Amino acid sequence: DFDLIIRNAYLSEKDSVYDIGIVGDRIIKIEAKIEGTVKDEIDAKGNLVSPGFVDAHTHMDKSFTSTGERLPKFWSRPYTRDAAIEDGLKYYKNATHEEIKRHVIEHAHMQVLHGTLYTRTHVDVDSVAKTKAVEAVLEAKEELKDLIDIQVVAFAQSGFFVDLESESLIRKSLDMGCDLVGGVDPATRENNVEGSLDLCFKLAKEYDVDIDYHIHDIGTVGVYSINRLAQKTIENGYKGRVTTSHAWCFADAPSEWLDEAIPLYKDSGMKFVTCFSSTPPTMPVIKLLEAGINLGCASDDIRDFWVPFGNGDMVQGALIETQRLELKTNRDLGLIWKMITSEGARVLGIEKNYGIEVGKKADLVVLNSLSPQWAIIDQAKRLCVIKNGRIIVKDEVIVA
Amino acid sequence: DFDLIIRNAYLSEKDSVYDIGIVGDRIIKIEAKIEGTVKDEIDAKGNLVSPGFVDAHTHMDKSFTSTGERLPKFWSRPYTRDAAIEDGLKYYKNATHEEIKRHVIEHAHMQVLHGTLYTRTHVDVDSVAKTKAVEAVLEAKEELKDLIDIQVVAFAQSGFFVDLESESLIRKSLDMGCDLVGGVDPATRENNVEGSLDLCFKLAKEYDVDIDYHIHDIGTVGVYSINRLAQKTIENGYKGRVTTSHAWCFADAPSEWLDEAIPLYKDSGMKFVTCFSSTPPTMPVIKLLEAGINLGCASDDIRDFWVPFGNGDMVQGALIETQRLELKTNRDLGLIWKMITSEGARVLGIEKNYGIEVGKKADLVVLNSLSPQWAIIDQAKRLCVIKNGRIIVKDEVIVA
Ligand SMILES: [Cl-]
Ligand SMILES: [Cl-]
Ligand SMILES: [Zn+2]
Ligand SMILES: [Zn+2]
């Protein structure tokens, strides 16, 4: 019979309560009542059971570097991208393989305590970090495979045309086994939009990897950089293989620029990720989703020299998004929930095995709340977390 | 001898770790090490101990009315003030004294679990509620005297010049013992700014009570309404006795209007409350505080037909404000912390007995975090809550 049954699980997509039967790492049966009994059971008690949350953009390598003292380190100054880059170069100067590795494990545990079972982390690759951070992350990734699936982005944080050693280092990193490649700000960092982008596509083709680009530039220069990225996506036959992270520019650029760009994004299969530690309040999130653009959600940095905040909790991030974007209706909170779940899945390219349906992966979160909406509102802690059909978290403890 | 000693308490205002000695409801000794006998002790273990949080604007009477189903009630339609007023009139048509009372105690317990020991609630007074809600709240207030101090605003939710029965009903309500009086939107609700305000000042003088006004109107009409309120504050000799809640208008009105109004606000001793369930993202919070304007913070409604959110947790609210306003520096998170503490106290008029100083009330919160900043960031649960020198909360349960 079953390896695991979840009793009395409210499923949002079906709007009813079901027993869930699991064998190995797969969901086999979803029924109003499953008969009769097996060794491992979890009673969800009428509360929501959800697939694992998806944190589509993190920086596990540099997380928790702000911790250590009474006040967060690094935060006696305001945030600016270039200064945050410089703090990274100091930090990476003499950080050891093991300090990074432990940060990554710490990060993952926190995430998984909150029911995130899938994440895509960017890792700094530049002339100071070299491939040291890539090494530590790949190593930790391997150790964490029973807790959390990780996609790794070889991330040229300093700029391909600013730090001229980046190209060969990204090349090593991808050969070490990073799963995607990405740059930062073609325009205001690189000062070369065509060049930075072409180089990124070249590297992606050499190693047959997907792309995740950090585009922070605000306004029309940001929309323009994404437009170029999207057009080159088509030219290079990379439809559906490119993610644009942040895209804060959609918030202040004229709405017309977005209206005109949307068919291009749909035609290029452009994917986006908005991080709840920075989503602009006038970000047209709802509009993007209603237009059928694939928009995921994410923590971004956690407790470092870019972002002091962070608990790796996508349910807390959903609440933050509702506040940033002033959402209140059940429909809208419902859309945000999709963003931390199935939209993130699609961004990650795992949609086929993702969801609470027969045949899907037994990667689940049993919550202490009645519905997506109530979970966002009441912020109750996770009751149970299940990965590969095995219970890995039970009542605030990693039991794996 | 002490009735209570808190060991190893990090105090933000002193930036060091101290023992806190308490007798009855008072702090009597603060010292690096307190030798002496003692009945009860709490070890804060190097973590931050803070005074009780101040939730300067709530609506305890209608709270939790959204609860009951799988999805929040009322949230199949978006929010507009007038529609919310209409849901209240339906709700209040059939609500019983006991229902309201229970909502108020639930609300208070929740607040207190999170270390709020002081709150100002508004209570709907209009031709449907009549004084029923005032009755339930005053009764509950009495029962809750050992957990939380409550100020009650007789609040003319429907408008003095719209619901004509409001004036006599507010009179009764103040005679029943409400501590302040308040209206809503002189301009777009009442359609009479001079009249609505003069009437309010009239009722305040008859019963010698302070004023708390809901001003939601956006833009210049909002600034104008507050300017008239502030000028009439001076004319009526009510300096320091008037609070403006919300003032969303400061966010979209031209910055010049605020610049010119600031001396008037200082001159009138105008107090403000921003609620974290609605603070506009471009609200000039930092600017107000730097100018020495007294700005408190608050939950506003909790789980009702105005706001579906709510946990009565001012530490969670502080995180939300950092996100709404995009704050990250230690200095700014510090200012937000003042807003949920000492600024709220000053809005309430209790600043003299408020704080962790010798002679002050023994109303305290022992946290599981190192500092104001880390508390906002890590959102750790409260370790211990102390009111009137007695432990009322210990490990997520009310032990009073
Ligand atoms: Cl170019
Ligand atoms: Cl008028
Ligand atoms: Zn990033
Ligand atoms: Zn209000």
Author numbering:
A (entry chain A), B (entry chain B): 4 to 403
Report text from the authors:
Trp309 has been shown to be motile in the comparison of the ligand-free AtzC structure and the inhibitor-bound structure, suggesting that this amino acid moves upon substrate binding.
AtzC is a member of amidohydrolase protein superfamily and is the third enzyme of the atrazine mineralization pathway. AtzC is a tetramer, according to PISA, our SEC data (native molecular mass of ~210 kDa), and previous reports, with the asymmetric unit containing half of the tetrameric structure. The second and larger domain which contains the active site is a TIM-barrel fold. The active sites of the independently solved structures show similar architectures, each having three histidine residues coordinated to the zinc ion (His60, His62, His217; 2.1 to 2.3 Å) as well as Asp303 (about 2.4 Å) and a water (2.0 to 2.1 Å) bound to the zinc.
